[PDB]
Amino acid sequence: DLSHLTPCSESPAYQAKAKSFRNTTSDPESGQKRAESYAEALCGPEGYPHLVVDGRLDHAGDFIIPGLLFLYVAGWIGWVGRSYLIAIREEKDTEMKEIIIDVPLAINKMLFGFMWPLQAFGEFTSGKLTVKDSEIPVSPR
Amino acid sequence: ATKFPKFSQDLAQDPTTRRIWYGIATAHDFETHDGMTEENLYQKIFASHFGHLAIIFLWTSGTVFHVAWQGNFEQWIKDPLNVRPIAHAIWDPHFGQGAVDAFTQAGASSPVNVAYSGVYHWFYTIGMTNNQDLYQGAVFLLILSALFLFAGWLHLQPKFRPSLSWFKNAESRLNHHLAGLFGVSSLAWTGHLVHVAIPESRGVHVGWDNFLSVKPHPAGLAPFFTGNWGVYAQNPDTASHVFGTSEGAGSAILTFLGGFHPQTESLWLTDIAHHHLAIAVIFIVAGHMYRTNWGIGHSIKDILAAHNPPQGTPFGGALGAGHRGLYDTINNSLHFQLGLALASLGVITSLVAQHMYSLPSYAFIAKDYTTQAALYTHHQYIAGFLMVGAFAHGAIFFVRDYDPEANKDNVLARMLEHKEAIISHLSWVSLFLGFHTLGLYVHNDVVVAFGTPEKQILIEPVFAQFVQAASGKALYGFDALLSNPDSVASTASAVWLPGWLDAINSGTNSLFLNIGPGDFLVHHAIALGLHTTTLILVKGALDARGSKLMPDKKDFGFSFPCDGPGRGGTCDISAWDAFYLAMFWMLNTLGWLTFYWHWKHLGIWTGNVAQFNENSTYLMGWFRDYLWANSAQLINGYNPYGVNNLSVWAWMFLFGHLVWATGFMFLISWRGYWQELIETIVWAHERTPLANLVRWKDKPVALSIVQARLVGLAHFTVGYILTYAAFLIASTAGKFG
Amino acid sequence: IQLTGTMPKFGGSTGGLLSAADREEKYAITWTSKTEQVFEMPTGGAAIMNEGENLLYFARKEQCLALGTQLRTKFKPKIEDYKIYRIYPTGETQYLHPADGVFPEKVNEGREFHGKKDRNIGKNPEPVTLKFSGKTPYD
Amino acid sequence: AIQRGSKVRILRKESYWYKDVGTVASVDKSGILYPVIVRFDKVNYNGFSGSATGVNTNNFAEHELEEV
Amino acid sequence: ILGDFAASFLPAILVPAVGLVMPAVVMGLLFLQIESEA
Amino acid sequence: SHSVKIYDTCIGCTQCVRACPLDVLEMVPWDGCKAGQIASSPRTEDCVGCKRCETACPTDFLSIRVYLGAETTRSMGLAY
Amino acid sequence: IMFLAGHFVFAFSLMFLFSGRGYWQELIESIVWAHNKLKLAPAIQPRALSIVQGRAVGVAHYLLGGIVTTWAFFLCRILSVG
Amino acid sequence: KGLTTFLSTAPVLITALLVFTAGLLIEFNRFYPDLLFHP
Amino acid sequence: SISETQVFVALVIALIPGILAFRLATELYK
Numbered sequence A: 001d002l003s004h005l006t007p008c009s010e011s012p013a014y015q016a017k018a019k020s021f022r023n024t025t026s027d028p029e030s031g032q033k034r035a036e037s038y039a040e041a042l043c044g045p046e047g048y049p050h051l052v053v054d055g056r057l058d059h060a061g062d063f064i065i066p067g068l069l070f071l072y073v074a075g076w077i078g079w080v081g082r083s084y085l086i087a088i089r090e091e092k093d094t095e096m097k098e099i100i101i102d103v104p105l106a107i108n109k110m111l112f113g114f115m116w117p118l119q120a121f122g123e124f125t126s127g128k129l130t131v132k133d134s135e136i137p138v139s140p141r
Numbered sequence B: 001a002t003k004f005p006k007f008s009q010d011l012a013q014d015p016t017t018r019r020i021w022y023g024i025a026t027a028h029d030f031e032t033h034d035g036m037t038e039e040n041l042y043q044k045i046f047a048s049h050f051g052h053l054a055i056i057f058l059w060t061s062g063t064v065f066h067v068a069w070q071g072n073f074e075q076w077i078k079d080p081l082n083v084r085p086i087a088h089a090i091w092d093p094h095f096g097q098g099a100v101d102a103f104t105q106a107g108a109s110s111p112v113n114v115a116y117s118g119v120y121h122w123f124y125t126i127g128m129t130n131n132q133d134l135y136q137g138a139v140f141l142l143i144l145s146a147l148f149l150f151a152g153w154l155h156l157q158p159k160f161r162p163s164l165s166w167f168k169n170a171e172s173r174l175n176h177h178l179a180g181l182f183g184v185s186s187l188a189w190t191g192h193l194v195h196v197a198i199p200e201s202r203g204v205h206v207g208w209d210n211f212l213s214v215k216p217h218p219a220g221l222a223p224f225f226t227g228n229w230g231v232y233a234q235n236p237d238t239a240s241h242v243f244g245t246s247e248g249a250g251s252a253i254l255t256f257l258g259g260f261h262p263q264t265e266s267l268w269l270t271d272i273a274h275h276h277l278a279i280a281v282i283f284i285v286a287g288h289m290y291r292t293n294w295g296i297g298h299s300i301k302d303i304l305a306a307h308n309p310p311q312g313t314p315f316g317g318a319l320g321a322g323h324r325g326l327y328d329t330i331n332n333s334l335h336f337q338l339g340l341a342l343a344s345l346g347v348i349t350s351l352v353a354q355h356m357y358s359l360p361s362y363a364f365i366a367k368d369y370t371t372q373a374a375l376y377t378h379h380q381y382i383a384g385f386l387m388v389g390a391f392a393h394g395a396i397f398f399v400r401d402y403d404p405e406a407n408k409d410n411v412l413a414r415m416l417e418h419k420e421a422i423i424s425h426l427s428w429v430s431l432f433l434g435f436h437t438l439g440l441y442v443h444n445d446v447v448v449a450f451g452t453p454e455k456q457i458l459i460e461p462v463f464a465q466f467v468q469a470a471s472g473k474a475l476y477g478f479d480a481l482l483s484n485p486d487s488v489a490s491t492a493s494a495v496w497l498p499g500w501l502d503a504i505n506s507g508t509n510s511l512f513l514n515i516g517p518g519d520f521l522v523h524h525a526i527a528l529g530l531h532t533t534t535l536i537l538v539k540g541a542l543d544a545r546g547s548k549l550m551p552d553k554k555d556f557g558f559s560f561p562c563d564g565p566g567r568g569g570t571c572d573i574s575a576w577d578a579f580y581l582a583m584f585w586m587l588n589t590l591g592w593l594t595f596y597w598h599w600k601h602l603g604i605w606t607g608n609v610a611q612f613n614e615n616s617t618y619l620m621g622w623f624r625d626y627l628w629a630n631s632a633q634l635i636n637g638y639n640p641y642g643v644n645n646l647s648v649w650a651w652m653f654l655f656g657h658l659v660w661a662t663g664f665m666f667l668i669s670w671r672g673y674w675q676e677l678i679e680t681i682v683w684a685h686e687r688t689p690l691a692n693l694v695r696w697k698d699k700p701v702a703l704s705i706v707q708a709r710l711v712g713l714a715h716f717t718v719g720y721i722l723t724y725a726a727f728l729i730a731s732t733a734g735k736f737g
Numbered sequence C: 001i002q003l004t005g006t007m008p009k010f011g012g013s014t015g016g017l018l019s020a021a022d023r024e025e026k027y028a029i030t031w032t033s034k035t036e037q038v039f040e041m042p043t044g045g046a047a048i049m050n051e052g053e054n055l056l057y058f059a060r061k062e063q064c065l066a067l068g069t070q071l072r073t074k075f076k077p078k079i080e081d082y083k084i085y086r087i088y089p090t091g092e093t094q095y096l097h098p099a100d101g102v103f104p105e106k107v108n109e110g111r112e113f114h115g116k117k118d119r120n121i122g123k124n125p126e127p128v129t130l131k132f133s134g135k136t137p138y139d
Numbered sequence D: 001a002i003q004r005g006s007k008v009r010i011l012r013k014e015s016y017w018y019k020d021v022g023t024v025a026s027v028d029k030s031g032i033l034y035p036v037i038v039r040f041d042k043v044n045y046n047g048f049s050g051s052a053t054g055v056n057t058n059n060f061a062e063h064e065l066e067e068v
Numbered sequence E: 001i002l003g004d005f006a007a008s009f010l011p012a013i014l015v016p017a018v019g020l021v022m023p024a025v026v027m028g029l030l031f032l033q034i035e036s037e038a
Numbered sequence F: 001s002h003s004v005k006i007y008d009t010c011i012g013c014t015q016c017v018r019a020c021p022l023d024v025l026e027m028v029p030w031d032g033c034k035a036g037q038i039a040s041s042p043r044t045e046d047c048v049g050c051k052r053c054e055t056a057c058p059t060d061f062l063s064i065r066v067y068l069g070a071e072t073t074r075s076m077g078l079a080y
Numbered sequence G: 001i002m003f004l005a006g007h008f009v010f011a012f013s014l015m016f017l018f019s020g021r022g023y024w025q026e027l028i029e030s031i032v033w034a035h036n037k038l039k040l041a042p043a044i045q046p047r048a049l050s051i052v053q054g055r056a057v058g059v060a061h062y063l064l065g066g067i068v069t070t071w072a073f074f075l076c077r078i079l080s081v082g
Numbered sequence H: 001k002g003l004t005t006f007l008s009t010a011p012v013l014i015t016a017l018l019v020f021t022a023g024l025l026i027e028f029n030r031f032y033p034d035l036l037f038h039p
Numbered sequence I: 001s002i003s004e005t006q007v008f009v010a011l012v013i014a015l016i017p018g019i020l021a022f023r024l025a026t027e028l029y030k
């Protein structure tokens, strides 16, 4: 239940720090906005917010939402890269547009890269995502 | 035509200085010696074992003899928390008056060294009281070392040289090593504990004169045979017991409280004796497992060949042929046995380091902080050495002892079949730890530097804190399986729990320390270090036989420089690159974890734990509050205004810096520059007058490529341990000294 | 035999023969040229190929063939008529580089198979087969 | 079945393109050990250090191949 | 400086023996061993 | 002395002999190649081990292969 | 921040300075198979940095990390005591 | 016509991508600063 | 503390592994 971690509003070390939060942007009340926004976290004896990473809810915003957001964005980047790499193979001049990127193909790969997990599941169930161990270069033992 | 080296004739006709350097380094590689058979190989290794055990026993005899002779074991047992233990005296012709005055310490009238190995606590705990009991132990260890030397000399004589079948008798060796080396020795240590150590902790002197007269229990050996063994746990030691004297003492020789002694802050000696008797019984039982001569038992080959999941099993034939081909692969190859031995020894040395700080077994050793620091760092660095050597000998086994015909489609062959899937996934987990550990450290550094430490990503290690709460810590409020008193584990017959629970829930010990956001990141740094060192080591062990750039890597052996600048460039491709590049990563990982241990324990011992708890989340707090802050009394060991007792530690600090930086010369600058330099020096010698009379017998050449990688590695390593041992010992001895 | 040759006009350098040339072995290169030109010694600096036939001494065979490569390539008269000898301090001379009289890159009858394996390099024995013997897996 | 232009997979373990598919440039009909010249899309490691070029063809035997 | 321990004159003999005398002996003997022919 | 071993995957391109700086290698006639010649290493006692021959070999793995063995005064390439 | 950054770059230099090309070529060979498994083979084949380029990267990182460290130390000392 | 091929090279496009990504992150941390976690 | 004679006794005891280490090292050489 994390009795050692108190909420930052009830913690009497966070309230001493929260007066002297510096402004980060040009907004004059940015320190006060940070102070009110970090009060819902858990603070230790230092008076600083802590993040609990075990997938629980009311602390899913620490890791689960940023983690799923990164997984979507990184899957977007990797899937668009893999799609471009596959698309530039079977047209007999691949190093030149590996080094000088074909922009009209890359734009069509990028803007249609939002549906990366559906295409990933389709290629996984279709077997066209993973190359079989026979048709692949392997170093000598 | 030079008699050195005798064992190698390729190096004997070497006309250069490489002959001496390579005769030094190939002296113990008996497998590549000229005219060496397996039958002579095993016997030479057997005799070298006896010589090495004699070296160990002579080193122990010298340690005990220097405690007895020029140490203070009489004065230290009176006040173990105030008197500094003396290792040995200093006789230096180079001392001035300032160094003699500074090193006249610990109540001595002579320049003496303060002991930081902490064998004083060990001797006081095991039953040593005066200097004569140490002197008789030193003399007995001298006799034991002479006995081992005579055994090693005897087993080189042709009458007593064992046959090859005796050396490869695995079943008998395992039986006598589990029953006798592990079980009889633990039973004998139980006998010493209940006969000497436990009564000497209770003020009853025993010695060699009274152990046949002083009976260890009031009911001596009568409850052992009847069966009512609880009589040996009827009257345990009171919490008001004072060590080394009879007030507050109990009478039971096998208690089972599981806590700490309230005075010495260590485990009970009766607990230690009960643990040793339990593991001696289990080790003797495990020693009665393999068949030797009497029909009953086990054969290892049948166990290995029967261990393969058949068809219809949910895993199926996933292991291929299973383990057939083992017990020939392992027993024929000495490097397989050596790698397994070094891996097991490195793991149990890591366990020794992680257990002697949290569960001290020696009297008043928890309150001698510098002894704890030296012991933890000393055992963890040796554990890293043993683990890297285990993987190095796995690489040696693959390059010169692995037979693909005998190991056909077994587990060992199928490791090599997907040998780079392991390397790719281990690279992935190394990058996954490294990018994000450095990202969180750099993020914390930047936001703390920008005046906003509340923008740090502070992560509470809830899994390890759940483990702490499951072991009985009520501080985190998990109420899980020992933290609440109404669990199925807590309401059991576990009678270790009244001692263990108030041993773990008291903050006066090192048992299950408070961990926070500064412990999460360092643990992931540690995981990065082990995963990356494993990546270099697995990568070089599995690519030892050959790979895509160099298919015939087994023809050149384990240790070769390169394969020329062709094929793109081939520097560090031998399986020796794994060892060479993983010594750096092992030393970096051990530096990370020993900095962790030292800074956390300095915060604990000083009483200000908040410094680590707020400053270890960013690397500038590490760099300032641990390195710069604790090097202050170190570097002031000698100043223009005088000399402290830490002047030798400041000198070792600078010495380690010098050796570590001299290693950079061998690691960065490479051979042909130095060969071109030595050619000019050779010209200058042969063309000057009055010095061309002096002619070299061997032609001076530069150090070879592998030799200089090894020399720079040895300099890096020796400088690393010397400067960190100096910093550690002076940092926690200038405060707690 | 006896090496009839005159030395190129060289000013003397420090990269030439050391003490081991008169005690272990030294090497010589003799070459005939129909014109006078300037060449670079592996010793260091530049010297003069005088008209006619030339004899130079070096401490290594590699210095002699580094000179012979400079005699073959990078010269317009295209000197190939060079011979390389080894002189031991006893006095024995061994004729080394154009043994058949033809350069080694050109095939010639009368040369036998040295170091030739009638097997693929991947089809080599494992070292575990050849344990505790003098034989190494490339034999 | 080995003819010029046929895509073929290498069975030499030590080759750079072991279990990789390349085209056949020429097959020699005289009695030589490695008559099948095979050219690949990728390039070998061969060359000096820093060289941006490498070889992409080699001779192979009949038993060192399989037709796809 | 002599110590209060028993036989304090033994550091004054053994330390120059093990630090100066026998390393000179060992380097001389090993030099003759590693540099002798045949 | 080093061991320069020439294997049967040799195309007879003579690049190893022209790349050799100490005349270790030469060409011998050979019926097993299209070029009609294979490399041989008669005076391999002069091999320093520079592996320029291994650099110039155009085979997928090198038909000429240098094994660094015992070190002599010619393998070290010492002018002194 | 620049003091710690220069310490990082000085330590980062020694990976290129101490190691050699043939380790990293084999490690990249292990990564190429994992890319080949998921149809991620690049057209431009990944090679390790050449030996001269490995030395150049190591010495450039060494000089950069040391010089940035000394710049940061000098300037922060002299902007506080001067 | 040859200029668009130069702008389609790897360094120019990776620089444009990194400047666009850094600008997007900087414009996000200006308008919505100090987001340690999702509320 | 130990006596002065005990140090010389331990030294001449230590000559027994002193000789036997020399005997093992020469036979390990052979």
Ligand code: CLA
Residues within 6 Å of the ligand: B055, B058, B059, B060, B061, B062, B063, B065, B070, B088, B089, B090, B091, B138, B142, E010, E011, E012, E014, E015, E016, E017, E018, E019, I007, I010, I011, I014
């Ligand atoms: C390996 C164990 C060990 C080590 C590290 C030390 C180290 C030390 N001893 Mg020694 N010593 C030891 C064993 C050990 N001793 C034992 C078993 C005895 C016999 C009971 C003594 C008796 C002794 C005396 C009487 C004196 C010392 C002293 C010394 C100091 C300087 C060395 C010297 O001049 O005397 C070395 C003299 C000897 C007689 C030692 C003989 C060799 C011993 C038996 C062990 C052999 C060493 C090793 C195993 C073999 C070489 C290994 C190689 C790979 C390095 C130093 C602190 C001196 C001192 O206190 O100065 C302040 C001194 O005068 N020692």
Ligand code: CLA
Residues within 6 Å of the ligand: A077, A078, A079, A080, A081, A082, A084, A085, A101, A106, A109, B424, B425, B427, B428, B431, G030, G031, G034, G035, G038, G040
């Ligand atoms: C299409 C691009 C792409 C894809 C999807 C992959 C995917 C993979 N790589 Mg990676 N990688 C790539 C490019 C790519 N990588 C490049 C450019 C480098 C050189 C820096 C590497 C070097 C590399 C290493 C060293 C490792 C991986 C690993 C892996 C695996 C785990 C993911 C990971 O660790 O990310 C790590 C990613 C990086 C370190 C760099 C990625 C750089 C960007 C994000 C790639 C995409 C942008 C691309 C340049 C342009 C897209 C094309 C566009 C014009 C449409 C996974 C199979 C690991 C593995 O084997 O696990 C099994 C492994 O150890 N990769």
Ligand code: CLA
Residues within 6 Å of the ligand: B045, B046, B047, B049, B050, B053, B166, B167, B169, B170, B172, B173, B176, B177, B179, B180, B181, B182, B185, B348
């Ligand atoms: C019961 C009879 C017996 C016993 C006691 C021994 C004893 C031993 N044998 Mg042996 N062996 C025997 C019969 C026996 N063997 C039989 C019959 C065979 C024939 C098949 C062999 C064949 C054989 C071989 C071929 C070899 C040995 C070797 C050895 C030595 C092992 C190395 C060593 O000293 O580590 C001792 C280590 C320990 C006691 C501790 C082990 C690690 C512990 C369990 C971890 C925990 C430590 C614990 C915390 C205590 C800490 C200490 C303290 C400071 C706190 C040891 C002296 C080697 C040798 O020659 O040595 C000279 C070797 O080469 N033996």
Ligand code: CLA
Residues within 6 Å of the ligand: B093, B094, E015, E016, E018, E019, E020, E021, E024
């Ligand atoms: C570990 C062994 C050790 C020992 C016991 C000594 C002993 C000594 N050192 Mg030395 N030294 C050593 C190692 C050691 N050194 C090493 C490793 C270094 C290199 C870093 C140095 C660096 C060093 C310097 C540079 C100087 C000393 C000097 C001294 C002397 C200081 C005494 C004094 O106040 O002046 C009194 C001096 C004397 C009474 C002169 C003693 C000369 C003796 C009696 C001659 C013996 C003759 C003998 C037969 C031949 C040598 C032994 C033979 C077996 C080879 C003393 C003799 C100083 C000195 O005086 O030089 C001699 C000095 O200048 N040392």
Ligand SMILES: CC1=C(C/C=C(\C)CCC[C@H](C)CCC[C@H](C)CCCC(C)C)C(=O)c2ccccc2C1=O
Residues within 6 Å of the ligand: G015, G016, G017, G019, G020, G021, G024, G047, G048, G049, G050, G051, G053, G054, G055, H014
């Ligand atoms: C890590 C390492 C490699 C591998 C290094 C590689 C494969 C380089 C990877 C390319 C990186 C990602 C380039 C990044 C640096 C850029 C110059 C910075 C700008 C890049 C923009 C995208 C920002 C070697 O090849 C090597 C060779 C010889 C000795 C030591 C080493 C060595 O240590």
Ligand code: SF4
Residues within 6 Å of the ligand: F004, F019, F020, F021, F022, F023, F024, F025, F046, F047, F048, F049, F050, F051, F052, F053, F054, F066
């Ligand atoms: S290693 Fe050098 S000297 Fe030896 S054969 Fe090859 S090219 Fe010639």
Ligand code: SF4
Residues within 6 Å of the ligand: F006, F009, F010, F011, F012, F013, F014, F015, F016, F017, F038, F039, F053, F056, F057, F058, F059, F062, F063, F064
């Ligand atoms: S370089 Fe290689 S392929 Fe060419 S002739 Fe020499 S051995 Fe044959």
